[PDB]
């Protein structure tokens, strides 16, 4: 529940205006902070095994999602200055591509790990 909530927290950056640069950067990087702290405090339950579990993969993909959201805003801020025709409809694409990708990941993950 908290990692998914932090992913939706990173998602809310897309509806914020593209001109407020410190707002979106601070939101993304503080969301990255929260993901790291939650991941570290969550791995202290299980032993020091060297293989990937079904819990490491989930938090790893959540971190990747937050990383991708921040790097997407970074490329957005570079592209509004380089050429605006490509950066106008990128955020509107992200607003629908990020939740569908995360929901598809959740469906495939939960079925693949509850079938085993």
């Amino acid at each position: 529940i908290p990692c998914t909530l932090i992913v939706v927290l990173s998602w809310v950056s897309f509806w914020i205006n593209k001109d407020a640069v410190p707002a979106r950067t601070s939101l993304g990087i503080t969301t990255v902070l929260t993901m790291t702290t939650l991941s570290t405090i969550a791995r202290k339950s299980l032993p020091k095994v060297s293989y990937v579990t079904a819990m490491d993969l989930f938090v790893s993909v959540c971190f990747i999602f937050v990383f991708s959201a921040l790097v997407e805003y970074g490329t957005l801020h570079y592209f509004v200055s380089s050429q605006p025709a490509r950066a106008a409809k990128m955020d509107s694409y992200a607003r629908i591509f990020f939740p569908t990708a995360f929901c598809l990941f959740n469906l495939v993950y939960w079925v693949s790990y509850l079938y085993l």
């Binding site: 902070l33 790291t36 702290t37 570290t40």
Partner: protein, 52 residues
């Protein structure tokens, strides 16, 4: 990076020498620190000349 190092530094014994993972964390910290310092340097020269 400080939070990451802290977690690993507050889980191992007090040995005086520098480990390999400590060297990797110090290298990563020096890279992020140098990125912040280059930002300071590009914020300093921006008013005198933005070409540099």
């Amino acid at each position: 990076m400080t939070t990451i190092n802290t977690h690993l530094r507050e889980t191992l014994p007090k040995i005086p020498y520098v480990k390999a993972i400590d060297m990797y964390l110090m290298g990563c910290f020096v890279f992020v620190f140098m990125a912040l310092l280059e930002y300071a340097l590009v914020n300093y020269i921006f008013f005198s000349q933005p070409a540099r």
